[PDB]
Design a protein around this ligand. Structure first.
Ligand code: TTP
Ligand code: MG
Lengths: 218, 1005, 419
DNA sequence: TGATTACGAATTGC
DNA sequence: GCCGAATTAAGCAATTCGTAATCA
């Protein structure tokens, strides 16, 4: 655990050693977009922008990636609803419970599973306006995603339209699975079997599969 | 409505999907028509009667013939017929996408189906009927039955159009600008409305000027506005705040123009304006549909194009706008990249390449000269274009090296007269072009005052007008109309797709006319196959005239002659031994007679085989030949219109269009040889190449050693058809119309695919041209047959061969005489290569000329020429190393960026990625960049060069060589001296010199 | 993302599990799937394979040569027969140890293999032993079943099964040559056995033990022996007349044996085997011109240059013997199998297989021998390049070229008759 | 410590 | 309340350069 100081809010970034060779550049890319970004109320609160930088990267295998936080009530760690209200987490829990067979559940978190890192491409969002901070985050998002992809083996992208050109935004090749968002109309996520494909690919690359029922909370 | 002429077709992507047509009437009124847009499927009667939810609409397409185009190998003359069926077919239209298991014709798009089934041309003039049209808004109607609305066609008429060309200039202190720190300084607009009025105006930011400076600017003639409502476009210079500037930009960009043309505006200009507008104010640029039911915000999006070669890989990127109002946002940068081939694609380079003229000196003295340009100096048209561009130009480049500032300019009735601040030059005719400016923008922004502001305003207005000049130079409107007519595509989609997409409209029309569907059953397997034949040159230096003879559209004509299509292949017969091969040949010669069936021998498909014969039918015309005939007709039309052109611009445009149609015709064959295509046919491509090789060998054998004596011409062999016997005369003696006293002999030296070089033992060019024309007429009349013709290209003097594809010569065209200037032609040499150098080219040119002069004079005592050339080269390179007077621009190479590499280590991609990581401006996936070799300044001369790719450095527009850095001359010197050595004849002294200087062994041809 | 992709990935993983025990078709499918997966997902943990060297040492250990100690658990003993070794997988072709190639097998054997694979899917691979056209089961393994019932239904199918033995031990016993001899006598099999493999119930690994001694024996002469329709096995005798067994004639060439010399040999209680691993043209011509001019090679076998005849054709047509050309159309319509076989199969290969010629040498002789034909029949021939004739086998094949052309004309003008 | 060969990449000509 | 929209790819032949792999 190391710390760095920046000019604007939250004035401090605490990071794990695995994120060492990016932090400096991040600072230089954050001091030029913070003033405009902090003119608006954002989800999440500024203090919870960089709480996924505390997690280690040397023991991760799969990354599940969105495009922006929840429009309202964001917690900082992607894809978490502590009261189990948001639609996306409910639907991902339903699909994974159908796969694994567990029937009695009251919540599901992707940050408890071992070897899985959840990520948001854009780290901030105005209240009620999806993809309203893309220009501020572009460089930071590209840099941090590229750093993540040097450690994981499979990258799972949620959103067909948003991640259409993900191969152009990355330099080194990596296994990529692009599917539908959980909250997509025309019910496309129900007929999605991406988790089994992820497990098959991992076991194809001499890697342990993922205990996808570990994230349930009782 | 009544008479309408179409401008654009565009789609809407809301909850309900529609198709829009934008058109104009004779008076100048704009009319929008809205159609429902469906998904189109083609099914049979048995499938149609068994669709559980009945389709929205179905139309009877009649009886159609379905053919299986798979290719199988046969070991004996028992060949099964092709699977052919005949059935009633239906074309069903669905509001939403449906999956049908056994649907056919699934490679064509929805817009093509709309056009072809409704009988509508994307670029036609029509006389609509209001019986089928209902008014839904002021200037917007709705059509439900497009088949009857567009039933009547009328002759084409001319309409007015509206244009906007814009440029921006932004402040920067140390590097490329950033939207979060650096503001916008200038915005320049050129504006053409429907009344033909041309207006030019520049807006200057006043937030970076002192109050006294604003007051003196207003006193000098400028206008100051504090609100959007108090701007007049009739004033050239207007100064305002940044917010008002962005609001004016937003108002201008929201209008319903026809073309908004910019140079690299989708990546820089429009993006910067949008982002700065959203930062300073919360506003957005909103586009509305013609029916006022869909509103969108401007947001540039990226299209990435991947390669079809190995490991796929991304290879190009393009940026587009997302408007839904009918306006076409055109970027000249992408168009010029996809159109022409240059070293650099910056605006200065394109201006230098396009706008050049020859000027005559009228005055000298002081620090200036006066040049004149007229139709008596360069050509008919170049002076006019130069005078057109000089109305706003500021700097002129003389002799490709000197940069000069314009003092006075006069536009005469015919040409131009310019005065430039240039040193004294001792000649009479010089070259002028529009290129770089020797100014330091960062330094000017560092100390900003009124004079610098006005100068930057002039530069920006010139940058805005260059867009219009290039728009007229490249003929984008004519090309757009031609492409929309031929390809059956909307006006906004012509310059976006490759050959596999632009040949689908004509293909669909042809299939519907012939009533044919082509299907595949099993997978496609790819094997290598051989290509054209290239002859080895017989000697290097000639000193005799060489006559060039060239076929016309060789591969399409081969396809037409043999009727080579995937559906006309009777079969392929193979054999693994001589016994079965002989039996098969004896039976095959009589089961399939020659006049109707054509049999082609080919190199075997697999290692264990010793024969392969492919049979093709000629009773019913194939599908590929008809496409080729269409494209050939278009090329002939545009060549004919080129022949009648007078001005230079029209000649250039028509030449480009005929070249485009030629390339498309060749692309059809290439697709026939492409695995992932719907027209894949291994046998057809193999046969096309085989017939081409046969034809080149026939022509070369007939021409090699041919004698013209008395009035008769004796060929080398019998003029016999190399495929089958025919009714032509095969006499090798023909009667000519040339004078009796002539006596000449003809020998063959070189050839590539559809070309033969014939040496004539003479030196004059008039007699040579006469004999060439007579010989061409005789060859066409008596030697060739069917649809094969040749052409007499030119006469080559002082021809020098180096390798099989590298030669330099002096060209006399067919319509030329002795008292005419030749044209220097280089093919494959180290002067057209884009990756060699600039120093290398100058040295090689001067030494080639010196060598030719020395051989003309001639001493060559023992090895005098070699000793002299090597000594001169040694002196020149030593002087260059010691003096270091040559700039960095003479040591710069070019390369294109992409991500299509086997293995990801790849020093090139790492270099570009590191540059992008450490620099503000980014190199994209289809961009060309400069690089050089740089080494520390303290190193001495290096003998053994160990790691060369570690010294590559990228040279940007703001690169200054450090005081501890130097150009790594050894690589350039090594390449130059290798090329010099490969030309001479001695070996021992050359090897000794090379080993003494670089410690390596030269390679020889 | 879809289910078809999921099943493609599962099939790819399954193929990747079993690669050493594979054939050409499986390799082609695996490479196609690897290319598709790399194209779709931009990166896959497996890469394309081109060599694919089959190996068996994964399931076997080093051969023992000294007495050892055994005691716990029940033991299963399986003898090792003599002959070539073949590997069989689930729905795959024939592969040879080290020199895996498509080897022809009887149709009944293929049908039995197909039915035994369809009976149960719990079979990894099968090891087959061949000894002069005597196909014998050698080894069978399974992670779920036991090597008792599998041999039971293999026996009931109709294919012979080795007499595997089951033994039990309570006390610390010493296994030596005496116990090996006792087991061999208990086997009561006259076939040559090399080693005994002892396995335990539950353990997948199999361990073999073999006993032998070194000796030097002289060579007197060479003689060939018949066992079937024009197929030969060589044999060399010594001064004492002892019988020696060898793997194949290729073993003779690789041993570089010379006339009237002495060579090393591994001798056992019952029989002995010559040891290999002691140019090629010299030996390949010396062996034949020592045994006799009337000899030529068919892979691992030797053959005459006999005159042959219509019986030599009708025997393999599975038709009643006859000598009247007119009647040669009657019995063809009597059996559907014969007519189907002759329609599907070609003419040149028919005469080639009737005369038992080799494939490569015959073809390389024909491809440099010009022919003159008329009405689909051969009427004249000549040689142009005699380089291949430097091979004595090519000359031996050329010897009966007249009978070849005669049977060729017979085949062509009878197939014309019967359409 | 050298000679020599094989492969990929960039470019131009048909 | 909390996305997604159907699709958009010519061939081979020859030369020149650097770097990695293999051979005495
Ligand atoms: C230029 C070019 C040629 N080719 C092939 C097909 C041509 O028949 C052959 C000869 O090239 P060209 O002589 O350049 O083309 P052409 O046959 O159309 O001749 P012309 O312009 O005089 O009518 O090379 C391609 O496949 N692609 C190309 O881009
Ligand atoms: Mg030509």
């Amino acid at each position: 655990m190391n710390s760095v100081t920046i000019s604007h809010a939250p004035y401090t970034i605490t990071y794990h050693d695995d994120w060492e060779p990016v932090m400096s550049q991040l600072v230089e890319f954050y001091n030029e977009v913070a003033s405009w970004l902090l003119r608006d109320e954002t989800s999440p609160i500024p203090d919870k922008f960089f709480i996924q930088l505390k997690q280690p990267l040397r023991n991760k295998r799969v990354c599940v990636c969105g495009i922006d936080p929840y429009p309202k009530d964001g917690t900082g760690v992607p894809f978490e609803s502590p009261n189990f209200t948001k639609k996306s987490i409910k639907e991902i829990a339903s699909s994974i419970s159908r796969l694994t067979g567990v029937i009695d559940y009251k919540g599901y978190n992707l940050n408890i599973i071992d070897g899985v890192i959840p990520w948001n491409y854009y780290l901030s969002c105005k209240l009620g306006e999806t993809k309203s901070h893309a220009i501020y985050w572009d460089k930071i998002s590209k840099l941090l995603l590229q750093h993540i992809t040097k450690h994981v083996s499979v990258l799972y992208c949620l959103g067909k339209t948003d991640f259409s050109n993900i191969r152009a935004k990355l330099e080194s090749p990596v296994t990529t699975i692009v599917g539908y968002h959980p909250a997509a109309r025309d019910h496309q996520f129900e007929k999605d079997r991406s988790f089994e494909i992820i497990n098959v690919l991992l076991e194809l690359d001499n890697k342990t599969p993922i205990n996808w029922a570990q994230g349930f909370i009782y | 409505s009544m008479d309408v002429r179409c401008i654009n077709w565009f789609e809407s992507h809301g909850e309900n999907r529609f198709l829009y047509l934008k058109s104009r009437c004779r008076n100048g009124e704009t009319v929008f028509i809205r159609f429902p847009h469906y998904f189109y499927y083609v099914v049979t009667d048995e499938i149609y009667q068994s669709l559980s939810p009945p389709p929205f609409n179905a139309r009877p397409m009649g009886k159609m013939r379905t053919i299986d185009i798979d290719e199988t190998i046969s070991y004996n003359l028992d060949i099964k017929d092709r699977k052919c069926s005949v059935a009633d077919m239906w074309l069903i239209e669905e509001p939403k996408k449906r999956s049908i298991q056994n649907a056919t014709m699934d490679e064509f798009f929805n817009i093509s189906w709309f056009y072809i089934s409704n009988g509508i041309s994307p670029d036609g003039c029509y006389s609509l009927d209001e019986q089928y049209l209902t008014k839904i808004n002021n200037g917007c109607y709705h059509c439900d039955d497009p088949r009857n609305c567009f039933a009547k066609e009328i002759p084409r008429f001319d309409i007015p159009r509206s244009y906007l060309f814009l440029a921006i200039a932004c402040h920067f202190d140390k590097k490329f600008p950033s939207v979060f720190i650096n503001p916008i300084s200038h915005t320049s607009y050129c504006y053409i409305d429907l009344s033909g009025k041309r207006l030019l105006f520049t807006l200057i930011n006043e937030e970076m000027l002192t109050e006294q400076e604003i007051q003196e600017a207003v006193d000098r003639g400028c206008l100051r506005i504090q609100s959007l409502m108090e701007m007049d476009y009739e004033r050239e210079l207007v100064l305002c705040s940044e917010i008002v500037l962005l609001r004016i930009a937003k108002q201008l960009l929201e209008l319903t123009f026809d073309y908004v043309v910019t140079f690299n505006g989708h990546n820089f200009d429009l993006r910067y304006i949008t982002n700065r507008l959203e930062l300073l104010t919360g506003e957005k640029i909103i586009f509305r549909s013609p029916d006022k039911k869909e509103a969108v915000h401007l947001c540039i999006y990226e299209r990435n194009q991947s390669s079809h070669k190995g490991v796929c890989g991304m290879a190009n990127t393009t940026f587009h706008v997302n408007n839904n109002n009918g306006t076409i946002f055109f970027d000249l940068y992408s168009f010029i990249q996809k159109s022409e081939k240059l070293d650099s694609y910056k605006l200065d380079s394109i201006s230098k390449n396009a706008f050049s003229c020859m000027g005559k000196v009228l005055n000298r003295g002081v620090r200036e000269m006066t040049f004149i340009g007229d139709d008596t100096t360069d050509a008919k048209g170049k002076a006019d274009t130069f005078a057109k561009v000089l109305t706003t130009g500021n700097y002129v480049t003389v002799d490709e090296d000197i940069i000069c500032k314009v003092i006075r300019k006069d536009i005469l009735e015919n040409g131009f007269k310019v005065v430039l601040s240039c040193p004294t030059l001792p000649n009479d005719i010089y070259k002028l072009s529009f290129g770089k400016d020797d100014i330091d923008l960062a330094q000017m922004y560092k100390d900003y005052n009124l004079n610098i502001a006005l100068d930057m305003a002039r530069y920006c207005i010139h940058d805005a007008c260059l867009c219009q000049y290039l728009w007229e130079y490249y003929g984008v409107e004519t090309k757009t109309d031609a492409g929309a007519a031929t390809y059956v595509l909307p006006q906004s989609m012509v310059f976006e797709y490759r050959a596999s997409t632009i040949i689908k409209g004509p293909l669909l029309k042809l299939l519907l006319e012939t009533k044919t569907i082509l299907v595949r059953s099993e997978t496609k397997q790819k094997f290598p196959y051989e290509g054209g034949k290239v002859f080895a040159p017989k000697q290097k230096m000639f000193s005799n005239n060489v006559l060039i003879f060239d076929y016309n559209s060789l591969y399409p004509n081969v396809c037409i002659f043999g009727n080579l299509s995937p559906e006309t292949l009777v079969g392929v017969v193979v054999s693994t031994n001589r016994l079965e091969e002989e039996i098969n040949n004896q039976l095959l010669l009589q089961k399939y007679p020659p006049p109707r069936y054509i049999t082609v021998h080919c190199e075997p498909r697999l290692p264990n085989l010793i024969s392969e014969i492919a049979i093709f039918d000629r009773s019913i015309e194939g599908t590929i030949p008809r496409l080729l005939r269409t494209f050939l007709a278009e090329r002939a039309r545009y060549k004919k219109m080129l022949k009648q052109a007078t001005s230079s611009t029209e000649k250039a445009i028509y030449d480009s269009m005929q070249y485009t149609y030629k390339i498309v015709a060749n692309s059809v064959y290439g697709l026939m040889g492409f695995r992932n295509s719907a027209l894949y046919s291994y046998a057809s491509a193999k046969s096309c190449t085989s017939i081409g090789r046969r034809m080149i060998l026939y022509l070369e054998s007939v021409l090699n050693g041919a004698e013209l004596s008395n009035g008769m011409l004796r060929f080398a062999n019998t003029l016999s058809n190399p495929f089958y016997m025919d009714d032509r005369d095969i006499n090798p003696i023909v009667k000519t119309s040339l004078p009796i006293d002539y006596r000449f002999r003809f020998r063959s030296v070189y050839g590539d695919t559809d070309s033969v070089f014939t040496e004539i033992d003479s030196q004059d060019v008039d007699k040579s041209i006469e004999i060439a024309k007579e010989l061409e007429r005789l060859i066409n009349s008596r030697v060739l047959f069917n649809n094969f013709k040749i052409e007499f290209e030119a006469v080559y003097k002082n021809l020098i061969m180096q390798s099989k594809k590298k030669y330099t010569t002096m060209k006399y065209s067919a319509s030329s005489n002795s008292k005419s200037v030749p044209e220097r032609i280089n093919k494959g040499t180290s002067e057209t290569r884009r990756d060699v150098s600039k120093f290398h080219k100058n040295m090689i040119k001067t030494y080639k000329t010196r060598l030719s002069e020395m051989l003309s004079e001639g001493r060559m005592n023992s090895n005098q020429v070699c000793i002299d050339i090597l000594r001169s080269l040694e002196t020149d390179l030593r002087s260059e190393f010691d003096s270091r007077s040559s700039p960095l621009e003479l040591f710069m190479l070019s390369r294109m960026h992409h991500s299509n590499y086997k293995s990801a280590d790849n020093p090139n991609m790492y270099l570009v990625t590191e540059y992008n990581k450490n620099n503000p401006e980014t190199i994209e996936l289809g961009e060309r960049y400069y690089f050089a070799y740089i080494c520390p300044a303290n190193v001495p001369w290096t003998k053994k060069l160990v790691n060369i790719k570690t010294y590559e450095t990228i040279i940007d527009r703001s690169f200054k060589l450090g005081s501890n850095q130097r150009i790594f001359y050894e690589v350039y010197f090594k390449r130059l001296t290798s090329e010099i050595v490969n030309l001479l004849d001695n070996k021992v002294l050359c090897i000794s010199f090379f080993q003494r200087m670089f410690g390596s062994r030269p390679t020889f041809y | 993302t879809s289910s078809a992709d999921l099943t493609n990935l599962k099939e790819l993983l399954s193929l990747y599990k079993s690669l050493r025990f594979s054939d050409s078709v499986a390799i082609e499918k695996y490479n196609s799937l690897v290319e598709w997966g790399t194209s779709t997902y931009w990166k896959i943990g497996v890469q394309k394979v081109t060599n694919v060297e089959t190996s068996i040492s994964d399931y076997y250990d080093e051969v023992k040569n000294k007495p050892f100690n055994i005691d716990p658990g029940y033991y299963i003993f399986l003898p090792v027969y003599f002959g070539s070794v073949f590997i069989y997988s689930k729905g795959k072709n024939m592969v040879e140890l080290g020199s895996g190639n498509s080897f022809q097998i009887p149709d009944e054997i293929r049908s039995a293999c197909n039915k035994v694979l369809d009976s149960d899917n719990g079979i990894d691979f099968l090891r087959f032993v061949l000894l002069n056209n005597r196909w014998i089961m050698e080894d069978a393994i399974s992670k779920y079943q036991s090597p008792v019932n599998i041999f039971k239904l293999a026996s009931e199918y109709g294919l012979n099964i080795p007499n595997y033995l089951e033994i039990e031990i309570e006390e610390d016993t010493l296994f030596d040559d005496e116990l090996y001899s006792i087991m061999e006598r208990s086997f009561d099999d006259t076939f040559p056995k090399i080693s005994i493999s002892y396995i335990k119930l539950g353990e997948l690994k199999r361990q073999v033990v073999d006993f032998f001694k070194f000796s030097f024996m002289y060579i007197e002469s060479i003689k060939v022996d018949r066992i079937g329709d024009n197929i030969f096995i060589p044999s060399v005798i010594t001064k004492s007349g002892k019988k020696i067994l060898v793997k194949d004639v290729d073993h003779l060439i690789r041993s570089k044996v010379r006339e009237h010399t002495f060579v090393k040999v591994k001798k056992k209680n019952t029989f002995s085997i010559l040891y290999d691993y002691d140019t090629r043209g010299e030996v390949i011509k010396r062996i034949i011109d020592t045994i006799g001019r009337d000899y030529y090679v068919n892979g691992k076998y030797f053959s005459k240059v006999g005159i042959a005849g219509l019986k030599q054709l009708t025997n393999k047509l599975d038709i009643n013997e006859c000598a009247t050309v007119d009647e040669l159309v009657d019995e063809i319509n009597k059996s559907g199998t014969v007519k189907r076989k002759i329609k599907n199969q070609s003419v040149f290969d028919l005469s080639r297989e009737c005369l038992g010629y080799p494939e490569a040498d015959f073809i390389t002789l024909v491809n440099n021998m010009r022919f003159k034909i008329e009405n689909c029949k051969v009427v004249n021939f000549n040689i142009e390049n005699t380089n291949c004739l430097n091979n004595p086998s090519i000359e031996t094949i050329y010897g009966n070229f007249n009978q070849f052309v005669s049977i060729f004309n017979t085949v062509t003008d009878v197939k014309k008759r019967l359409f």
